[PDB]
Write a protein that holds these residues in place. Structure first.
Motif, PDB file in Angstrom:
ATOM      1  N   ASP A 147       1.198  -1.708   0.004  1.00  0.00           N
ATOM      2  CA  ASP A 147      -0.100   0.118  -0.230  1.00  0.00           C
ATOM      3  C   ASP A 147       0.689   1.023  -0.117  1.00  0.00           C
ATOM      4  O   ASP A 147       0.419   2.582  -0.362  1.00  0.00           O
ATOM      5  N   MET A 148       2.009   1.530   0.184  1.00  0.00           N
ATOM      6  CA  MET A 148       3.180   2.526   0.629  1.00  0.00           C
ATOM      7  C   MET A 148       3.328   2.274  -0.528  1.00  0.00           C
ATOM      8  O   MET A 148       3.954   3.971  -0.949  1.00  0.00           O
ATOM      9  N   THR A 149       3.489   1.979  -2.171  1.00  0.00           N
ATOM     10  CA  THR A 149       4.043   2.170  -2.786  1.00  0.00           C
ATOM     11  C   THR A 149       2.941   2.616  -3.705  1.00  0.00           C
ATOM     12  O   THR A 149       3.369   2.892  -4.623  1.00  0.00           O
ATOM     13  N   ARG A 150       1.883   1.662  -3.046  1.00  0.00           N
ATOM     14  CA  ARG A 150       0.884   1.843  -4.022  1.00  0.00           C
ATOM     15  C   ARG A 150       0.775   3.971  -4.140  1.00  0.00           C
ATOM     16  O   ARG A 150       0.411   4.428  -5.075  1.00  0.00           O
ATOM     17  N   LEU A 151       1.014   4.776  -2.761  1.00  0.00           N
ATOM     18  CA  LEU A 151       0.781   5.600  -2.249  1.00  0.00           C
ATOM     19  C   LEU A 151       1.877   6.517  -2.814  1.00  0.00           C
ATOM     20  O   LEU A 151       1.478   7.804  -3.577  1.00  0.00           O
ATOM     21  N   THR A 152       2.853   5.880  -3.025  1.00  0.00           N
ATOM     22  CA  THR A 152       4.537   7.090  -3.357  1.00  0.00           C
ATOM     23  C   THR A 152       4.649   6.721  -5.127  1.00  0.00           C
ATOM     24  O   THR A 152       4.145   8.245  -5.320  1.00  0.00           O
ATOM     25  N   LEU A 153       3.825   5.598  -5.564  1.00  0.00           N
ATOM     26  CA  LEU A 153       3.652   5.675  -7.386  1.00  0.00           C
ATOM     27  C   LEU A 153       3.117   6.755  -7.153  1.00  0.00           C
ATOM     28  O   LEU A 153       3.166   7.508  -8.481  1.00  0.00           O
ATOM     29  N   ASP A 154       1.447   6.366  -7.167  1.00  0.00           N
ATOM     30  CA  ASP A 154       1.156   7.375  -7.726  1.00  0.00           C
ATOM     31  C   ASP A 154       0.439   8.642  -7.370  1.00  0.00           C
ATOM     32  O   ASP A 154       1.088   9.643  -8.028  1.00  0.00           O
ATOM     33  N   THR A 155       1.526   9.233  -6.211  1.00  0.00           N
ATOM     34  CA  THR A 155       2.075  10.470  -6.561  1.00  0.00           C
ATOM     35  C   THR A 155       3.360  10.770  -6.441  1.00  0.00           C
ATOM     36  O   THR A 155       2.651  12.502  -7.119  1.00  0.00           O
ATOM     37  N   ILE A 156       3.753  10.264  -7.241  1.00  0.00           N
ATOM     38  CA  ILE A 156       5.010  10.782  -8.119  1.00  0.00           C
ATOM     39  C   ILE A 156       4.772  10.643  -9.967  1.00  0.00           C
ATOM     40  O   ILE A 156       4.867  11.631 -10.351  1.00  0.00           O
ATOM     41  N   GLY A 157       3.418  10.127 -10.355  1.00  0.00           N
ATOM     42  CA  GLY A 157       3.307  10.215 -11.292  1.00  0.00           C
ATOM     43  C   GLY A 157       1.774  11.294 -11.729  1.00  0.00           C
ATOM     44  O   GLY A 157       1.896  11.549 -12.999  1.00  0.00           O
ATOM     45  N   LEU A 158       1.199  11.705 -10.613  1.00  0.00           N
ATOM     46  CA  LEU A 158       0.007  13.044 -10.540  1.00  0.00           C
ATOM     47  C   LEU A 158       1.441  14.124 -10.691  1.00  0.00           C
ATOM     48  O   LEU A 158       0.895  15.255 -11.415  1.00  0.00           O
ATOM     49  N   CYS A 159       2.033  14.349  -9.580  1.00  0.00           N
ATOM     50  CA  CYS A 159       2.882  15.061  -8.993  1.00  0.00           C
ATOM     51  C   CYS A 159       3.890  15.407 -10.017  1.00  0.00           C
ATOM     52  O   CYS A 159       4.339  16.509 -11.056  1.00  0.00           O
ATOM     53  N   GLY A 160       4.227  14.329 -10.971  1.00  0.00           N
ATOM     54  CA  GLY A 160       5.301  14.030 -11.923  1.00  0.00           C
ATOM     55  C   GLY A 160       4.531  14.842 -13.201  1.00  0.00           C
ATOM     56  O   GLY A 160       5.764  15.898 -14.083  1.00  0.00           O
ATOM     57  N   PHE A 161       3.653  14.176 -13.867  1.00  0.00           N
ATOM     58  CA  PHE A 161       3.129  14.525 -15.238  1.00  0.00           C
ATOM     59  C   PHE A 161       1.894  14.039 -15.110  1.00  0.00           C
ATOM     60  O   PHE A 161       0.860  14.037 -16.268  1.00  0.00           O
ATOM     61  N   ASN A 162       1.103  14.605 -14.249  1.00  0.00           N
ATOM     62  CA  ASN A 162      -0.201  14.606 -14.412  1.00  0.00           C
ATOM     63  C   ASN A 162      -0.671  13.469 -14.842  1.00  0.00           C
ATOM     64  O   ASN A 162      -2.318  13.373 -15.379  1.00  0.00           O
ATOM     65  N   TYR A 163      -0.636  12.125 -14.259  1.00  0.00           N
ATOM     66  CA  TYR A 163      -0.950  11.031 -14.859  1.00  0.00           C
ATOM     67  C   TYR A 163      -1.234  10.076 -13.527  1.00  0.00           C
ATOM     68  O   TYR A 163      -0.707   9.862 -12.677  1.00  0.00           O
TER      69      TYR A 163
END
Ligand code: HEM
Ligand SMILES: O=C(CCCCCn1ccnc1)N[C@@H](Cc1ccccc1)C(=O)O
Length: 454
Positions: A143-159
């Motif tokens: 679950d922590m990886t779901r959170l950190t991956l999603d966070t960099i996708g959204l902040c990183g390139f709005n994905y």
């Protein structure tokens, strides 16, 4: 002049077989325990020196005497992270260019602009846990990886990776993880040219192509749409290096994105996983952190300013980074002939490895309770001697993502502590799985909702 010790050798392979083990960082820590603050480590075509004491590492962190070296791991990661910031040499034109362009995107001030997107994912994490049935538990690293991956996708390139909607990883992540796995395997091969690894190599080439194709399309799509979202991709498309006056090119932008996705995946989720592990193993500390969360997080959703007031949570995270820093080593080379610690003469080009978890156990710095989890050690950064705490690396080559990682980690851990009581229901036995990062493998907890609405 002192002669440095060296661990056991295997004929012509020198020390290389010591790395052919499931947990090489932990093996190197044990060698440092046996041999002390410095030991020589040799492999075919390689000589390096592992440092573990603040006494020697404070000298190694002198940027006039030492610069960042690409370790063999980083050299192999460069096959897919290219001349992104983490795998470029300081003297490459694209290092300073990208550094100058990206610094304002990563500042404490820029976190105010990412905050809303981080909250978006953090709330998804809280809702998942609110929605578990009584008989269920949490797979914490997962679950922590779901959170950190999603966070960099959204902040990183709005994905939106939408990791909380799925079990199967994203195609990009399948290839990224398999690429990182090939890197670790390759570091452990006594005979790396053996045809037995031809398939591994063919697969690695395929995974590089997948990463390149998918990220190149993200960049192309963004250019074609003209959209100006407040993310790292927009900053890279529009930014110009003040020094050269040039923007980054698309190929280097792709390498930076790949670099951020590596960094924001298990490297960053490892911090949250280890932090929650130490909290449930130390109930008085968990209670104090939970008391702070409840005092500060008075609104349905945290504000940027409230996260900055989570001082004890920040101390928890630093203590977790002290014991299990999730980038466990970095490499340096001597810019000129120099003497380390008045005892070890080094020649220009000689390499050093900084064994961070072992630095962080230096009892001359931290005292005899180094293995205990005591966030209070970080009350005053001014009491800590120079270069004793290095979880984000050193100097101009330090982690550009440090504020990003700490802000997202403090935010979500704050919310976790506000919304749930935690139970170590299996009396979990720490097992640290090693990739190029570290994870408490199989760490599971049960969370009982405090029933506080969002
Ligand atoms: C807890 C999480 C993290 C830790 C412990 C960590 C640690 C580090 C360390 C130790 C280095 C220096 C490596 C070396 O000298 O070879 C580094 C470099 C770097 N990190 Fe991180 N990092 C984390 C999260 C992130 C995130 C989330 C990002 C980006 C979104 C990121 C981006 C980078 C970059 C670009 C560099 C290269 C900087 C340069 O050389 O100019 N890191 N990181
Ligand atoms: O000690 C280490 C720990 C791994 C460092 C990489 C950590 N990380 C992860 C992501 N970014 C960097 N790595 C040495 C191993 C080695 C020594 C001698 C001969 C061969 C291999 C290296 O990779 O060179």
């Amino acid at each position: 002049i002192k002669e440095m010790p060296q661990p056991k050798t295997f004929g012509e392979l020198k020390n290389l077989p010591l790395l052919n083990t499931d947990k090489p960082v932990q093996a190197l820590m044990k060698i440092a325990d046996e041999l002390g603050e410095i030991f020589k480590f040799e492999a075919p075509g390689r000589v390096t020196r592992y440092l573990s004491s603040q006494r020697l590492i404070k000298e190694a962190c002198d940027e006039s005497r030492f610069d960042k070296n690409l370790s063999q791991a980083l050299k192999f990661v460069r096959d897919f992270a290219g001349d992104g910031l983490g795998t470029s040499w300081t003297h490459e034109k694209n290092w300073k260019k990208a550094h100058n362009i990206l610094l304002p995107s990563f500042s404490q001030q820029a976190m105010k602009g990412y905050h809303a997107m981080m909250v978006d994912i953090a709330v998804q994490l809280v809702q998942k846990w609110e929605r578990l049935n009584a008989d269920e538990h949490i797979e914490v690293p997962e679950d922590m990886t779901r959170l950190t991956l999603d966070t960099i996708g959204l902040c990183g390139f709005n994905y939106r990776f939408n990791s909380f909607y799925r079990d199967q990883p994203h195609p990009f992540i399948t290839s990224m993880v398999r690429a990182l796995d090939e890197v670790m395997n390759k570091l452990q091969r006594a005979n790396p040219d053996d045809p037995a690894y031809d398939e591994n190599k063919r697969q690695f080439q395929e995974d590089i192509k997948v990463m390149n194709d998918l990220v190149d399309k993200i960049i192309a799509d963004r250019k074609a749409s003209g959209e100006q979202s407040d993310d790292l991709l927009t900053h890279m498309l529009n930014g110009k290096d003040p020094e050269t006056g040039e923007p980054l090119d698309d190929e280097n932008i792709r390498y930076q994105i790949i670099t951020f996705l590596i960094a924001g995946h298990e490297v960053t989720s490892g911090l949250l996983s280890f932090a929650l592990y130490f909290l449930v193993k130390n109930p008085h500390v968990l209670q104090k952190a939970a008391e702070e969360a409840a005092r500060v997080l008075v609104d349905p959703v945290p504000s940027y300013k409230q996260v900055k007031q989570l001082k004890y949570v920040g101390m928890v995270l630093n203590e977790a980074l002290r014991l299990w820093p999730t980038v466990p080593a970095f490499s340096l080379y001597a810019k000129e002939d120099t003497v380390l610690g008045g005892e070890y003469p080094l020649e220009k080009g000689d390499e050093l490895m900084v064994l961070i978890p072992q630095l962080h156990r230096d009892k001359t710095i931290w005292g005899d309770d180094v293995e205990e989890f005591r966030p209070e050690r970080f009350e005053n950064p001014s009491a800590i001697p120079q270069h004793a705490f290095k979880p984000f690396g050193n100097g101009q080559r330090a982690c550009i993502g440090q504020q990003f990682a700490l802000h997202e980690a403090t935010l979500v851990l704050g919310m976790m502590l506000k919304h749930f009581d935690f139970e170590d229901h299996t009396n979990y036995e720490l097992d640290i799985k090693e990739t190029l990062t570290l994870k408490p493998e199989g760490f599971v907890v049960k969370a009982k909702s405090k029933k506080i609405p969002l």
